[PDB]
């Protein structure tokens, strides 16, 4: 009787971190831990590298 809701799967928030790095001290290479711990921790350690 109504199409009241969209049905997204992996919702986007209203806010996000944005990060400026200092190029001189940053390493371009992606950080690599154990595969599982990277599946969880990984997007974070790469953002606050």
């Amino acid at each position: 009787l109504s199409d009241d809701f969209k049905q997204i799967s992996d919702p986007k928030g209203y806010l996000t971190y944005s990060v400026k790095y200092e190029d001189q001290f940053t390493k371009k290479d992606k950080l690599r831990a154990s595969e599982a711990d990277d599946r969880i921790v990984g997007p974070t350690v790469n953002l606050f590298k």
Binding site: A33, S34, E35, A36, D37
Partner: protein, 99 residues
């Protein structure tokens, strides 16, 4: 220092290489409790078919089974009386923690 490492995860390559260098240079004794492995006891004549860098012992996934090898040198016959003297010193790093 008898250093004990319960969980390798998150350890830097620099820190690890430095711990190893401390084992060699400062005679550190570094137990690493997180390693699960399956030992194979070799006889002296079959040598060590499968090798292991210190780097891999430090940086292997927490869940994976390592496969170490360990010699039983009980059946190694004595050197001939006139074999040239060995100035070099054979050295070792990895040992089991349990029988």
């Amino acid at each position: 220092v008898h250093m004990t490492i319960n969980e390798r995860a998150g350890m830097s390559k620099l820190v690890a290489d430095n711990i190893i260098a401390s084992v060699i240079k400062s005679n550190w004794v570094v137990d690493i409790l997180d390693i699960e492995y399956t030992a194979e006891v070799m006889t002296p004549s079959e040598g060590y078919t499968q090798h292991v860098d210190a780097e891999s012992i430090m940086t292997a996934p927490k869940g994976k089974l390592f496969h170490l090898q360990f010699m039983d040198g009980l059946l190694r016959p004595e050197p001939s009386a006139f074999d040239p003297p060995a100035s070099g010193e054979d050295m070792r790093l990895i040992y089991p923690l349990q029988p």
